[PDB]
């Protein structure tokens, strides 16, 4: 019961490192690189995933 809940939280935290088809996993990097109109197209793929 400890190991299952630890493994579920590790899987949840590792999923932040996924691109989900965006140019990056890192939200501040998208917002640092792109102006608003093009940034939000990348943000929506991170939100969905």
């Amino acid at each position: 019961v400890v190991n299952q809940n630890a493994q579920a939280l590790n899987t949840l935290v590792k999923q932040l490192s996924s691109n989900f088809g965006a140019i990056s996993s890192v939200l501040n990097d998208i917002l640092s690189r792109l102006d608003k109109v093009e940034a939000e197209v990348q943000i929506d793929r991170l939100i969905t995933g």
């Binding site: 990056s24 501040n28 990097d29 640092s32 690189r33």
Partner: protein, 49 residues
Amino acid sequence: RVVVLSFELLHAPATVCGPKKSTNLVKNKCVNFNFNGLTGTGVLTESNK
């Protein structure tokens, strides 16, 4: 005449950067930060790593 400034971003330490001045270093307070284009918000503390 054409010039094409290709550039690369994540893979390594920074090598080319913008002109904006480095601050004094704040410790043991919540701050935004930038070190060589690694950015975030956090408390910064004296390491032993």
